[PDB]
Amino acid sequence: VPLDGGRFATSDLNDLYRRVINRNNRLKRLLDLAAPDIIVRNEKRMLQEAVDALLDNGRRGRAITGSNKRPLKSLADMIKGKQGRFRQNLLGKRVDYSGRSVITVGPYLRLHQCGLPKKMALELFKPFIYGKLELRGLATTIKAAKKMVEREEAVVWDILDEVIREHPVLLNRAPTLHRLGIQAFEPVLIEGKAIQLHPLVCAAYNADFDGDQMAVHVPLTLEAQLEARALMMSTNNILSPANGEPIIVPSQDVVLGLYYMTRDCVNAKGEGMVLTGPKEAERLYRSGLASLHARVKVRITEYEKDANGELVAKTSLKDTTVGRAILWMIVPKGLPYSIVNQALGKKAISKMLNTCYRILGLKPTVIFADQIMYTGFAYAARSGASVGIDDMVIPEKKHEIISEAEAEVAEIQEQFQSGLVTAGERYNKVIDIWAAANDRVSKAMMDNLQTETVINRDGQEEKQVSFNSIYMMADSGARGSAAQIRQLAGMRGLMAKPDGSIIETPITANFREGLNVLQYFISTHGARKGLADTALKTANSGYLTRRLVDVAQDLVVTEDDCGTHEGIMMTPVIEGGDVKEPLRDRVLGRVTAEDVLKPGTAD
């Protein structure tokens, strides 16, 4: 095929094929001329070479293309393709009806939907729109339909809302790892060029909002609609396939909200009063009378279905706070008030969802989950958590710890100066005290930071766990960890020189203070190795999953019960101490090999 400017472009096989013919033909001539043997032989060798280069080039000499250095590609190279082993099914294939762009938040969404730009949706469904437009007769014929939407006549937008309604779209993010990398959503038309994505799902995709882009795919055939709805829909996969724990667990803002919701200070507006039920608890709160967190008795009605498919009801006076009371409005049915009466960290807040699922079933867990998010963001929004520079509190004793540990190193140095201890023994020695010092500062600043809110109810003093912002973040499970906090307030670490030794003069400053020239420079090596290390551990993981799906792949659940009594004995891992992992988790959801006994038997 021709190109612009009249240039031509062609496959390399022609250059190859052409040669086999020429050489071949010359040989036919050379027979009728009865040329000497030395020649027809040479021609014969040349003919062999040409065919070799045509078939699979590179097993002898690698013939090069004409006027172009690069070796011409043979049929064997056509089959191989490249990027390792990829035959064009394996590397990928471009696909119609698809698109992609940057994704953003959309907290309003229900978990089953996602924000899709109007224009993307116009161009994506173009054929569907054409069909509905002339089904109702709003367009005389298919051509005119094109002209209408190309014109963007006001009527089509309403039509698009029809064809969109029940019609899922697939959303996908870049490194698809587990099956949750593709999930189906119901489209909601959105002005703007960005895709809006339900927050609860952001965990499964490993999608941050830093500009990650997602691609969209329209399932066309009906079976794809029904496959999408019953398989790839968001709500139908709420649990990680890796382990049964819910993967929809609220992430960070929401968990800061609920933690800030259910938490209690020692003395707060409305402390001690009593209320009939949660309705009037919110009524107290919204009005400014009662604090979100104050110890209060309120009447609640919980339910237990422990009858046969049947819910028991019980009402009692629970000793709780205002927040837990308010939140109780959401917990559906079955569940006990016991589940919300705690501080509601990220871990408990997940098992909240888990029990909700394993008890009430699916639908309630979804709708519960939606509610949890909406309420989480909201109250977190009310809370006004923030972070200032004075929210990171350094221990008053830091300089003193450092100084003592600084005497120790100078003591051991004197012991090395006097030869009382060997050089190697010394290195370990100094590092031991410094390692120990850091732990000390860490568990110093941790004590001060955690509880030092010291407050008074009607009396002199009392002290509870801090309401300091940054602690709330780490305690809740929202973000941050004692490790990262330790670098903010307490000293940060002992870095390591490139060869792997670890420097015996740790970084005594932290981020709240400044790091000086030297200290930063030393931090660089660790930093740079991390990025390098992670990017490689990234590649290894990918490589491993590859081998893994290759060895399995075609394995599928086929029969129902093979009916073998055979099986393995499951015990908790019990490593050296008590229970590094229980039995209850190991056996859950598996099937018993044989009836199991009580301590007495025929039971």
């Binding site: 030395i38 032989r41 040479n42 060798r45 040349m46 070479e49 002898r60 000499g61």
Partner: peptide
């Protein structure tokens, strides 16, 4: 392999003709 080599060596066996030898063969022709 690379037939330039197996050629170069296959013809390299043949000895150049003497000025007399050319005529001999030509006469033979």
């Amino acid at each position: 392999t690379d037939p330039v080599r197996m050629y170069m060596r296959e013809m390299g066996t043949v000895e150049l003709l003497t000025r007399e030898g050319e005529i001999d063969i030509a006469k033979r022709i």
